Amino acid sequence: LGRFWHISDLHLDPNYTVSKDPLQVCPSAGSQPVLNAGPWGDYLCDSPWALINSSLYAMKEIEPKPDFILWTGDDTPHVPNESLGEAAVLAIVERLTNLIKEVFPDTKVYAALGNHDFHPKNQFPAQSNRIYNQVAELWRPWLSNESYALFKRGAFYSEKLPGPSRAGRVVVLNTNLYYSNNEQTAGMADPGEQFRWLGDVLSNASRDGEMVYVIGHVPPGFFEKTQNKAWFRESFNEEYLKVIQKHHRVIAGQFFGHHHTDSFRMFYDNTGAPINVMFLTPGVTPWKTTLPGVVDGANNPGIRIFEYDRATLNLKDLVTYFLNLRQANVQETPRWEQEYRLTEAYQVPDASVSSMHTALTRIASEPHILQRYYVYNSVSYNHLTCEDSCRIEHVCAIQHVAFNTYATCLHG
Ligand SMILES: *[C@@H]1O[C@H](CO)[C@@H](O[C@@H]2O[C@H](CO)[C@@H](O[C@@H]3O[C@H](CO[C@H]4O[C@H](CO)[C@@H](O)[C@H](O)[C@@H]4O)[C@@H](O)[C@H](O[C@H]4O[C@H](CO)[C@@H](O)[C@H](O)[C@@H]4O)[C@@H]3O)[C@H](O)[C@H]2NC(C)=O)[C@H](O)[C@H]1NC(C)=O
Ligand SMILES: *[C@@H]1O[C@H](CO[C@@H]2O[C@@H](C)[C@@H](O)[C@@H](O)[C@@H]2O)[C@@H](O[C@@H]2O[C@H](CO)[C@@H](O)[C@H](O)[C@H]2NC(C)=O)[C@H](O)[C@H]1NC(C)=O
Ligand SMILES: *[C@@H]1O[C@H](CO)[C@@H](O[C@@H]2O[C@H](CO)[C@@H](O)[C@H](O)[C@H]2NC(C)=O)[C@H](O)[C@H]1NC(C)=O
Ligand SMILES: [Zn+2]
Ligand SMILES: [Zn+2]
């Protein structure tokens, strides 16, 4: 049994300050007054350094010798572009990179850029640029020569897992190329040729007897905290689905972030068979989202470990840990705790596709399992009851990555 951490959406707010002025605590809160801010963060703000530092040392306490770490990006705060230029973006990515290197000096890390890890935000080019070049330098100890060259061109690459994993590979995507707010890739069918490359990597994996973990920042499909919100342009969503449908037999897991909330996505083939699952890990940042229509969309800080079979990459379990921010802020030191173990929460034997399908069916049919999933969705921040419209928004997002079937499901 191996273990790996998955962390995402740290979103440092460099200017977080415990201030007597509620409008000068954190620029990431915008114009929202931040009353009696605490040292470990605030639900209206992105993460203070103290919180990010606490999260890394919590990971070290829980599992100091993981087989590897997956890090799916989003390092900078939710502020206007004019507040956050290229030098600051790169300095922030470097500071977080250095913290991970300091706390886990002997650990391989597979890192993807998130949509905020660029200036201007979301405008990821399908070609080389100063940010891809400098991040390749920061992540060079983690990249093969081939991956270093690929990263400079498109911020995507693939790496063979080291032993004792028998025959595994991690594929790291730049899914920021597909975000509808990214004007750099408007009108491009296959920006950076990433889909062509991905298919080729996965065909090679089948030839070579390897199983693959696919990671990225922005997921396909819809955001479960609202209705009708997809990040990918429709054509990219369709292409991503086509890749999974063709190559699922070599894909042992998909690991994404961006939402900051804890959910998962099922993939099915045209016979109705479940063929893959994507795990959307929560964020370290607690920041209450400004996405229109989302009420009280904050979360507790979360981190996650997966347990896996080193011989096959089959996922055996996951454990999500959290910091109860409201409690931590009245205490001298933040102490992270176990939120849940997946097999226990859903009463399933492992984290296989069949087990996740069972989890969904229970979420969709048993009130107490729906509510359990819902509480965990915000990392145990919000305990109000998930009522009928909440249920449909979550169930449809989990079940339907495709635009048209998601739309039909929402009619329920
Ligand atoms: C699916 O699987 C296939 C294998 O079946 C992969 O194909 C291999 O891809 C690699 C990577 O591109 C190829 O290796 C590269 O070969 C280049 C050419 O090498 C010859 O020719 C040059 C000039 O003619 C000579 O200089 C050289 O000595 C050889 O005679 C090299 O230029 C490449 O160098 C790269 O890596 C090193 C660092 O390790 C750097 O020094 C270079 O700057 C450069 O970064 C590299 O060695 C290999 O030839 C391919 N094999 C076959 C059989 O085709 C596919 O890539 C894979 N598909 C995907 C999508 O992953
Ligand atoms: C955070 O505040 C900085 C300004 O802080 C000063 O510069 C830092 C480098 C550091 O030395 C602090 O102690 C200083 O008080 C903002 O940076 C400025 O932003 C304005 C635009 O509003 C721009 O005109 C200035 O040139 C910027 N200064 C520098 C040095 O770049 C920064 O935008 C704030 N960060 C966030 C994320 O909101
Ligand atoms: C980052 O977090 C670590 C872990 O909590 C902090 O290190 C602790 O610091 C206290 C006070 O100096 C010591 O009593 C502990 O022994 C330290 N623990 C470890 C494991 O080193 C560290 O101070 C934090 N750094 C920042 C910049 O906040
Ligand atoms: Zn994020
Ligand atoms: Zn994001």
UniProtKB/Swiss-Prot annotation:
UniProt keywords, alphabetically = Cell membrane, Disulfide bond, Glycoprotein, Glycosidase, GPI-anchor, Hydrolase, Immunity, Inflammatory response, Innate immunity, Lipid degradation, Lipid metabolism, Lipoprotein, Membrane, Metal-binding, Secreted, Signal, Zinc
Q: What class of enzyme is it?
A: hydrolase
What is the disulfide pattern of this chain? 26-45, 386-390, 396-409
This entry's Gene Ontology molecular function terms read: hydrolase activity, acting on glycosyl bonds; phosphoric diester hydrolase activity; sphingomyelin phosphodiesterase activity; zinc ion binding
Q: Mention any Pfam family matching this sequence.
A: ASMase_C
Which GO terms of the cellular component aspect does the record hold? extracellular space; plasma membrane; side of membrane
Q: What happens on changing residue 116 to A?
A: Reduced phosphodiesterase activity. Decreases inhibition of innate immune responses
**PANTHER family associated with the record:** ACID SPHINGOMYELINASE-LIKE PHOSPHODIESTERASE 3B (PTHR10340:SF25), SPHINGOMYELIN PHOSPHODIESTERASE (PTHR10340)
Please report the name of this protein according to its UniProt entry. Acid sphingomyelinase-like phosphodiesterase 3b
Q: Which organism is it from?
A: Mus musculus (Mouse)
